[PDB]
Amino acid sequence: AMRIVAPVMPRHFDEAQAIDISKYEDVNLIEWRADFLPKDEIVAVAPAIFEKFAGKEIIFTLRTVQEGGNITLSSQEYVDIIKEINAIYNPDYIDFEYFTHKSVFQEMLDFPNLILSYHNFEETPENLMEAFSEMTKLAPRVVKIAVMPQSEQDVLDLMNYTRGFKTLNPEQEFATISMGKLGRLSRFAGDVIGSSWTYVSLGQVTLNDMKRIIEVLE
Amino acid sequence: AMRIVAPVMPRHFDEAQAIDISKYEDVNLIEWRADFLPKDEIVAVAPAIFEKFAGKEIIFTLRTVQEGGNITLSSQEYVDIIKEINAIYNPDYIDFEYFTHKSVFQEMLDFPNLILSYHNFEETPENLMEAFSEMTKLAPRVVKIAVMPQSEQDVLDLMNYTRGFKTLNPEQEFATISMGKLGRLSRFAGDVIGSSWTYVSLGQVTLNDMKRIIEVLE
Ligand SMILES: [Mg+2]
Ligand SMILES: [Mg+2]
């Protein structure tokens, strides 16, 4: 069934320490958006995140600038930070920006818990099927794709691609959305399309709106 | 933009007369489901319907048994009742079950205000594109199609067919849905797919749930 993913994004240590866990009571999957920190504070802030959310599963996500994130890193810095956090903290899942940082993907080959991710804020690309195929054939823990529609048909394409790949790979977990106001319908289509990880806020949708929609759709 | 269609379905005259119009305040399009009456009471009940809803546009719908309705009529009886109601009352729109009563469609050729309708409660048929094409090429006032999905892909097919036909015929108004719990997503997809007439209740969805969804999608 559907899994709700809620982000945690402290900008410093005093903030991370100060987080209210009761805010996350309805959620068992936490995404630490480590890109909200300066690169030199990520490892310092990790203990607070892992200690606070010890009751939940934790995703380590270093969302980099080319993928819409708040940190600018070389692919080398990127993989080095991921591996250091991994070696010490053992996050349940690790986000890897497959296309942006493909040059260092060979360093990540042995990980069974990757969320292979791809975000396109410009368009729904003409080779989207090929992107699904390449990511799905790797059989990561999750295939995560977010694309910007430039027409209503773009939104339907995202939905139909997810359904086709899910039907061919029923054991593969997907988190796929069409972004923007235009693509918002796709955010409530996970049960139809085969997208089971739902990224929410506490285009973008809150947990409250999600619940209300899941109500009507059951 | 979207038009909400609310049904009126009295089973006798005392009932029709007794209807509370304030229930329909948010709605400017009324569907008189005349099939809830015995055939010999439809014309007797019409004055009450047309007088009560004089402020709104009115659809005359004789939904027959093979299309999921509450009356059993020959195609001849069907067209005769429609034409009598039309001659006296001038309904703003008339529903015509294009496939079920095709044998008498020649009698309806000159009407510019038809809702050509098709309901399949068994499946999403393999020639659905052909059904869209035949109905759309007639350029009725509305093409109305409701089909039962037997898989998630069936729901997406209904949605993609509507979008393709809408894009090719942007002046054509559509009212298309995938039925059941499975197809419920399609009921909130009208803006994406190009379905602008929304049939509600006061799978099936109420005006209240609709409003709440239109809120989130804008
Ligand atoms: Mg380890
Ligand atoms: Mg007339």
Q: Helix A152-168 to helix B152-168 angle, to the nearest 10 degrees?
A: 150
- The CATH number of the domain where A69 resides is what? 3.20.20.70
> Does the CB of B10 have a partner CB in chain A at under 8 Å?
no
Residues near A92 by beta carbon (within 8 Å), at least 6 away in sequence = A57, A58, A59, A113
Centre of ligand 2 to C-alpha B24, Å, is: 25
For residue A177, the Cα-to-chain-centroid distance in whole angstroms is 11
Resolution value, angstrom units: 1.9
Is A166 designated active site? no
**Could you give the count of Cα atoms lying within 13 Å of A73 in the half-sphere of its Cβ?**
28
Residue ranges making up the domain that contains A104: 1-218
- Identify the closest residue of chain A to B160 by CA–CA distance: A156
Number of domains in chain A: 1
Of A153, A192, A209, the CB nearest to B152: A192
SS3 of chain A = CCEEEEEECCCCHHHHHCCCHHHHCCCCEEEEEHHHCCHHHHHHHHHHHHHHCCCCEEEEECCEHHHCCCECCCHHHHHHHHHHHHHHHCCCEEEEECCCCHHHHHHHCCCCCEEEEEEECCCCCCCHHHHHHHHHHCCCCEEEEEECCCCHHHHHHHHHHHHHHHHHCCCCEEEEEECCCCCHHHHHCHHHHCCCEEECECCCCEHHHHHHHHHHHC
| Method of determination used here | X-ray
A170 in contact with B at a CB cutoff of 8 Å?
no
Chain B residues in contact with A201 (beta carbon < 8 A): none
Place of tokens 């390449």: A134
CA dihedral B21, B22, B24, B27 (to 10 degrees): 120
Is residue A197 within 8 Å of A142, Cβ to Cβ? yes
Interface contact A152-B193, CB threshold 8 A: yes
Residue A90 CA, ligand 1 centroid: distance in Å: 5
Ligand found nearest the CA of B111: 2
- CA A9 from chain centre, in angstroms, equals 13
How distant is the Cα of B178 from the closest Cα of chain A, in angstroms?
Answer: 12
Q: Among residues B46, B52, B47, which one has the least CA distance to residue B34?
A: B46
B119 is catalytic: yes
Residue A158 phi/psi, 5-degree rounding, is -55, -45
What's the gap in Å between B59 CA and the centre of ligand 2?
Answer: 14
